[PDB]
Design a protein around this nucleic acid. Structure first.
Length: 50
RNA sequence: GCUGGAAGGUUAAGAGGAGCGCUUAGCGUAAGCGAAGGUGCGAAUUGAAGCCCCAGUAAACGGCGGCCGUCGG
């Protein structure tokens, strides 16, 4: 977990998670918006096409 | 389309009657001004229904889609 606060370009203290599922080969750096727990940019898919 | 509302816009004829002309006494050296009256044109303001507008209505009119992916977007 990385508790990314941000005194961002506004001044508001926008807090989120940045979960990195370190899993060797197929890991995934995931900026998880903490208050919503929503992905905002991720790496590996499973659409769930299967 | 109908039913309803319709704050508001716009909308008549009509009441209008600000003013604008012309005639012409009189004033006028001329130039012209010109009162009154007449006569003609007349704006402002007001002017409903209505349509503009907002609802509701499909056993009203009427209408009942496309593109990408592999059923979803």
């Amino acid at each position: 977990i990385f508790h990314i606060k941000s005194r961002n370009e506004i001044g508001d203290e926008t807090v989120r998670k940045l979960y990195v599922e370190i899993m060797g080969r197929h890991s995934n750096i995931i900026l998880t918006d903490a208050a919503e727990n929503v992905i905002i940019d991720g790496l590996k898919h499973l659409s769930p096409s299967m």
